[PDB]
C-alpha cells in the first residue's frame, strides 16, 4: 500500500497531522516482549494492575494483565496514559488491583516480578497533547485501528463531523465495522503512519 498512488486513485486529500493526537514525529518503541509494566484495566480506568508486554507493533504494545488468560489481551501506544512503570501505583498512593477471571494475593505481585525486566521509565513517552480544534472534514482520509481486529489498522475516510466527534468509515468495506469516535481519539493516526513506525497498513476492502 502506497498513499501517494493511492489518493491519486481515489482523488482524495489525507487529513493533516495537525488534526490528530498523536505526536508529530512518533514516539520510539523500545520495549521487549516480556517486560513488566503497569497497565489500566481496559474495562475498569480506576484499575491498575501489573501487566505483561506480549508483542511489540509498530508503536504500540500488545499487553495481557498478569494472573488472567491470553483471550483479553489489548493494544496500547507508549505513549497512552493507560501505561505506566512499575512502581508508579504504590507511587501514587494506591494500591494495584487483581485482573478480571484471576485466580496470598501481595506474594502473587511478587512472585509474578521476581527475576523478571521492568520496562524503564524512560520507554514511556510523553502523552500528546488534544488539539485546540477539531479540524477534520469530510473526505479526508487516514489511517483508523479496526476496533473488532486492534492488531490491524486499515485506509479510512471521514464520512461525517458532528461536534467533537468523527465518523471513521473503513475504504472498500461495506460500513460493518465503521463506528464514530472523538476528533482526539488515540485509535486514529494521520496517512503514513503505519510506514514511519514500521507496522503494516491494510489494503481497502474490495466493495
Known amino acids: 500500500?502506497?498513499?501517494?498512488?493511492?489518493?491519486?486513485?481515489?482523488?482524495?486529500?489525507?487529513?493533516?497531522?495537525?488534526?490528530?493526537?498523536?505526536?508529530?514525529?512518533?514516539?520510539?518503541?523500545?520495549?521487549?516482549?516480556?517486560?513488566?509494566?503497569?497497565?489500566?484495566?481496559?474495562?475498569?480506568?480506576?484499575?491498575?494492575?501489573?501487566?505483561?508486554?506480549?508483542?511489540?507493533?509498530?508503536?504500540?504494545?500488545?499487553?495481557?494483565?498478569?494472573?488472567?488468560?491470553?483471550?483479553?489481551?489489548?493494544?496500547?501506544?507508549?505513549?497512552?496514559?493507560?501505561?505506566?512503570?512499575?512502581?508508579?501505583?504504590?507511587?501514587?498512593?494506591?494500591?494495584?488491583?487483581?485482573?478480571?477471571?484471576?485466580?496470598?494475593?501481595?506474594?502473587?505481585?511478587?512472585?509474578?516480578?521476581?527475576?523478571?525486566?521492568?520496562?524503564?521509565?524512560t520507554l514511556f513517552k510523553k502523552e500528546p497533547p488534544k488539539p485546540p480544534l477539531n479540524n477534520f472534514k469530510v473526505g479526508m482520509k487516514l489511517e483508523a485501528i479496526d476496533k473488532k481486529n486492534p492488531y490491524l489498522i486499515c485506509p479510512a475516510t471521514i464520512g461525517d463531523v458532528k461536534g467533537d466527534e468523527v465518523h471513521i468509515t473503513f475504504d472498500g468495506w461495506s460500513g460493518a465495522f465503521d463506528y464514530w469516535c472523538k476528533y482526539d481519539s488515540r485509535d486514529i493516526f494521520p496517512a503514513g503512519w503505519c510506514r514511519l513506525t514500521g507496522d503494516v497498513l491494510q489494503p481497502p476492502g474490495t466493495s
Open 1 to 121: 500500500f502506497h498513499w501517494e498512488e493511492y489518493l491519486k486513485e481515489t482523488g482524495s486529500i489525507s487529513a493533516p497531522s495537525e488534526c490528530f493526537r498523536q505526536s508529530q514525529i512518533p514516539p520510539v518503541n523500545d520495549f521487549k516482549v516480556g517486560m513488566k509494566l503497569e497497565a489500566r484495566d481496559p474495562r475498569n480506568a480506576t484499575s491498575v494492575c501489573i501487566a505483561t508486554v506480549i508483542g511489540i507493533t509498530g508503536a504500540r504494545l500488545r499487553l495481557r494483565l498478569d494472573g488472567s488468560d491470553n483471550r483479553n489481551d489489548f493494544w496500547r501506544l507508549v505513549d497512552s496514559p493507560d501505561i505506566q512503570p512499575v512502581g508508579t501505583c504504590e507511587k501514587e498512593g494506591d494500591l494495584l488491583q487483581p485482573p478480571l477471571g484471576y485466580q496470598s494475593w501481595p506474594m502473587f505481585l511478587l512472585e509474578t516480578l521476581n527475576g523478571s525486566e521492568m520496562a524503564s521509565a
